[PDB]
């Protein structure tokens, strides 16, 4: 029903209880309260209704002061319907933001306090401070700088006439006039300003900016007009650009809307395994604890095992486990890793659970005393290693029910001991042609033991002559010897800056040392915002390999998120979409908090999106439930009735799209909304604004795989466009937003091949003719040809099988594109290069043998392939970092090896191209045979 019984606690102590509408706003509820409170004791001592604010307990178990009284009660979602009147006064800005952050990040800020963790407290204090300072500094900037922050230029990767429709703000009168394609925006502004003058006549051209009508996209800066994506899109399609002149003030309106060294301790490292807790194992078996010390993926010494005790819930050991390494030789990122095993009594071992521990803390102190390591359960995978050194050093947050190991790190000295400061490391770190020839060939494939000892000897030569081989030298360094670690880090500090490509490799789990990650980030600061955005997904995933909360990578990502609002938008959603994953909830939540505090403007946009997304979840749940009961037309009508409810419609309308924050999702076209017939019943939601745009909301599948694939295809598109090859790709938006939840951009004016063929027929070629009659058909065929080649090469390189008429689409322009990339890297053997007969036929213009056109198509495929090979190491490094994501189809070196083989990186370019040619020709032969069946 509509009404709900709400408890009201007055500041006099008086208590009222009465029904109010779930749709009623808090301002209306306060009026109903005041009218009822006058007939209750002690009314006269109350101040007026505007002197008080309602407080509730919200869904994240925190108190919230309800400052916005235009909010409906059903939107506020109080845990229990209990509203308390309290005094407004106090720091209401900080109170409001603190409460909004909790709801937005999906995790109450109180949960960070409840941990009683200094690392956490130091992170929040330092990062929130830094983010606020940037936010305040940003506010003091001019209108141009703020425009660059909030609406960065959308430029093509990168002379004829072009007429543009220019309009002014708050005026339906518009001006159409000719402009050169290579004109700067400022020249177009000066033109429209003169025509506005030629009517009272005066304003300057510098005070204006240009906006794309019905979008938050802006044309400014020194670039020519055709380099802007909107104009480039307009020039190609043939539509005339529709721009609005916007004043400086209008942009400002938006803005204001002690005496003991570590090296002295020569005793061996050891631990006390005390007790296990809440173990769930087979009672017939026995329990064992494997322990080992690691640096990255390398063992520092041999793995020592506990004794066998009987299986119970609360096993006891009380053993001094000693390791084959001194305390003086432990590196900064030395990692104690445990695995609990249930074993059959000696007279297939079960990996139960695992847990890792940094031996040094976030302030560089070697840890002493007891620890309670709450364990993660072991998943049986193909490479069944004894331990899990790559796994997170953070504890399982399910402290209520998860298994635990209690250990004790002993006292090494009377006073605390720190890992030596940089100055002491560099102090200890200082100090033939045959072996020079041996080094050359070794660096021109991970090194064998005999090769490692040569590279180490000639490490000074590697710095001087082979600076790009830093990664190789770091792997050969003996991280279980402090003398060697000191020497390697001495070289590292003076090491020359490396290209972006090399820096990306150094972010991987093999290079855990803080100085290495710091050197990596230093090399990544070169990155433009456009390039960074291409790697953003990967840079976020490598946060899962970090040991401490306060790290260089987090600082870098926040830095860039605070300087560029588009980067901050997608950083937010990449972190937010993983808040349900307990291993990252804490780390990601802390980054989101700091981000939010430096980004109050975008907080408001993200809030609107989160509420839209929460309504879509409930709308989709209703549709799943309804679809299994009734036929589709009735479910569709029931979907629309649920949508037209005030709270639904308002929450679903007038938001910036999560897929692209410059796109406005204005009015919901409820009659055009529907859902798709696949298993999860994804919702198809249409919007209208000012020149139609659509989104698919999908709940039930993890869309990260699809996002990765589409980002790679987009990167391909960029790399091709950078060499002057536009293969006319449709890398449509895909964005994970939550737990098995995300959005997919709708491509309008497109259909599936199956639908077109369903209606040896010319069905595909006639559909193109019907959509591109007369002179426009040649363009359409050329668009098909270019896009067919791009997607043929893309799908082959990424190993995307299961390609059929249902998941390949065509735009009315002719552009062909693929959808639904649930499988890649040969999953469903090597996926062969594939040509479809029906596509060859469209490429040949409906003729049997059109060698001129076919050879051009072959050329495009071959050039496309050749360009990707030149950037092969970029794809390998990016995929290597994506192994942190934990995608089932990207878990191991075999998955990476798939990409090496498909790009033929072990071959010369000539060799690669000759093999590709054979594969191409063989695909043409196969194309004939497939359709005859």
């Amino acid at each position: 029903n509509q009404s709900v019984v709400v408890d009201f606690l007055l500041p006099t102590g008086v208590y009222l209880n009465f029904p109010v509408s779930r749709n009623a706003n808090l301002s209306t509820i306060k009026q109903l309260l005041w009218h009822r409170a006058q007939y209750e004791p002690l009314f006269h001592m109350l101040s007026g209704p505007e002197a008080y604010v309602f407080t509730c307990i919200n869904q994240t178990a925190e108190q919230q002061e309800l400052e916005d009284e235009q909010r409906r009660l059903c939107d506020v979602q109080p845990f229990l319907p209990v509203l308390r009147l309290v005094a407004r006064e106090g720091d209401r800005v900080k109170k409001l933001i603190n409460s909004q952050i909790s709801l937005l990040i999906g995790k109450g800020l109180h949960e960070f306090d409840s941990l009683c963790d200094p690392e956490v407290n130091d992170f929040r204090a330092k990062m929130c401070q830094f983010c606020e300072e940037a936010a305040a500094r940003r506010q003091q900037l001019g209108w141009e700088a703020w425009l660059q922050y909030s609406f960065p230029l959308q430029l093509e990767p990168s002379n004829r006439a072009l007429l543009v429709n220019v309009k002014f703000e708050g005026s339906e009168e518009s001006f159409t006039f000719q402009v050169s394609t290579k004109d700067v925006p400022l020249a177009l502004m000066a033109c429209a300003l003169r025509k506005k003058a030629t009517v009272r006549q005066v304003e300057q051209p510098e005070d204006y900016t240009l906006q794309v009508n019905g979008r938050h996209e802006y044309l400014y800066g020194s670039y020519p007009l055709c380099q802007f994506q909107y104009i480039c899109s307009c020039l190609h399609s043939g539509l005339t650009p529709h721009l609005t002149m916007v004043h400086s003030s209008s942009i400002l309106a938006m803005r204001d809307e002690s005496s003991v060294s570590l090296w002295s301790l020569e005793q061996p490292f050891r631990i006390e395994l005390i007790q296990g807790s809440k173990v769930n194992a087979d009672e017939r078996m026995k329990l064992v604890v494997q322990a080992g010390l690691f640096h990255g993926n390398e063992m520092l010494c041999k793995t020592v095992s506990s004794s066998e005790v009987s299986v119970c819930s609360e096993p006891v050991w009380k053993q001094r486990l000693e390791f084959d390494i001194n305390i003086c030789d432990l590196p900064r990122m030395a990692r104690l890793c445990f695995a609990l095993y249930a074993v059959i009594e000696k007279a297939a071992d079960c990996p139960i659970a695992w847990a890792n521990l940094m031996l040094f803390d976030y302030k560089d102190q070697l840890k002493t005393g007891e620890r309670c390591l709450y364990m993660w359960p072991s998943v049986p995978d193909e490479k069944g290693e004894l331990l899990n050194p790559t796994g997170t050093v953070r504890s399982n947050p399910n402290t209520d029910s998860a298994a635990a190991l209690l250990i004790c790190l002993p006292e090494v000295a009377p006073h605390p001991v720190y890992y030596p400061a940089l100055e002491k490391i560099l102090e200890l770190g200082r100090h033939t042609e045959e072996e020079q020839l041996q080094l050359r060939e070794i660096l021109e494939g991970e090194l064998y033991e005999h090769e490692k000892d040569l590279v180490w000897k000639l490490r000074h030569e590697v710095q001087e002559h082979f600076p790009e081989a830093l990664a190789r030298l770091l792997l050969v360094t003996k991280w279980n010897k402090h003398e060697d670690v000191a020497q390697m880090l001495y070289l590292l500090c003076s090491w020359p800056e490396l290209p972006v490509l090399s820096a990306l490799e150094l972010l991987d789990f093999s290079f855990p040392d803080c100085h290495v990650g710091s050197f990596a980030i230093k090399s990544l600061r070169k990155l433009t915002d456009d390039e960074l955005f291409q790697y953003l997904l990967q840079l976020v995933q490598v946060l899962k390999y970090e040991s401490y909360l306060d790290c260089e990578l987090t600082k870098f990502l926040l830095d860039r998120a605070l300087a560029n609002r588009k980067i901050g938008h997608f950083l937010f959603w990449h972190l937010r979409s993983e808040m349900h994953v307990p291993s990252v909830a804490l780390r990601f939540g802390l980054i989101l908090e700091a981000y939010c505090r430096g980004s109050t403007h975008h907080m408001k946009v993200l809030m609107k999106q989160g509420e839209a997304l929460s309504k879509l979840k409930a709308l989709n749940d209703f549709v799943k439930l309804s679809s299994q009961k009734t036929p589709k037309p009735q479910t569709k009508e029931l979907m629309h009735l649920c949508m037209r409810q005030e709270a639904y419609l308002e929450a679903l309308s007038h938001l910036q799209s999560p897929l692209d924050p410059s796109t406005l999702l204005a009015e919901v076209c409820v009659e055009q909304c529907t859902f798709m017939d696949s298993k999860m019943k994804p919702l198809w939601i249409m919007y209208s604004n000012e020149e139609s745009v659509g989104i698919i909301f999908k709940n039930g599948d993890d869309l990260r795989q699809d996002m990765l694939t589409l980002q790679m295809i987009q990167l391909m598109d960029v790399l091709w466009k950078q060499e002057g090859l536009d293969l006319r790709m449709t890398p449509y938006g895909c964005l994970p937003t939550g737990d098995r939840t995300g959005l997919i951009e709708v491509v309008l004016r497109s259909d599936t091949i199956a639908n077109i063929q369903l209606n040896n027929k010319d069905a595909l070629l006639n559909w193109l003719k019907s959509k591109n009659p007369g002179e426009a058909l040649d363009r359409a065929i050329e668009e098909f040809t270019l896009s067919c080649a791009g997607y043929c090469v893309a799908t082959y390189v990424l190993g995307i099988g299961d390609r059929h008429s249902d998941n390949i689409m065509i735009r009315e322009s002719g552009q062909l594109f693929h959808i639904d990339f649930g499988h890649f890297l040969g999953n469903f053997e090597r996926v062969p290069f594939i040509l479809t007969y029906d596509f060859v036929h469209v490429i040949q213009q409906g003729k049997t043998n059109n060698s001129e056109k076919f050879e051009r198509f072959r050329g495009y495929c071959e050039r496309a392939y050749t360009i990707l090979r030149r950037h092969g190491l970029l794809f390998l490094h990016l995929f290597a970092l994506m192994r942190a994501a934990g995608l089932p189809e990207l878990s191991c070196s075999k998955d990476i090896q798939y990409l090496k083989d498909s790009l033929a990186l072990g071959k010369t370019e000539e060799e690669a191209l000759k093999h590709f040619r054979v594969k191409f020709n063989e695909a043409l032969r196969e194309s004939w045979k497939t359709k005859v069946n």
Binding site: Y15, E62, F79, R84, D282, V379, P380, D400, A403
Partner: protein, 163 residues
Amino acid sequence: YQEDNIEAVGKKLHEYNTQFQEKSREYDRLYEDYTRTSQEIQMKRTAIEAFNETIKIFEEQCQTQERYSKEYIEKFKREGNETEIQRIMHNYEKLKSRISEIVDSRRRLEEDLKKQAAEYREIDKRMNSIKPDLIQLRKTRDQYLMWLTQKGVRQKKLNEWLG
């Protein structure tokens, strides 16, 4: 120093692959329950915190009622307005019984969390009993596959047996 016909070993490869796929699907189902239950236990635990914070607000209201009302109970006693005293105190009694309803709701949820905590532990126990069979079946499947590869059995024949 340093055991069957090919068709017989291939039949056993097919059987062990079929047993491995089934045991994997059993484990994947359990891991899904494990994942779902861990999320649900977390939600209940924050719900208990929310009850705690709600009960806390109500106890502040009781504290407030007791300090604040005193002067007005004494003032209305001098003026003979004992009915107004009776209204204040009856209103406070209604507050108190509302606190008992909320405490009872918190208790129901603590007992549900208790049951689901035991379910979590039973799910983990079943997972840990499945793992030996799952791992053993993977290793056995791989050994049969290597034996056949050594014997020179073609990839197309191996594919028929592997599902």
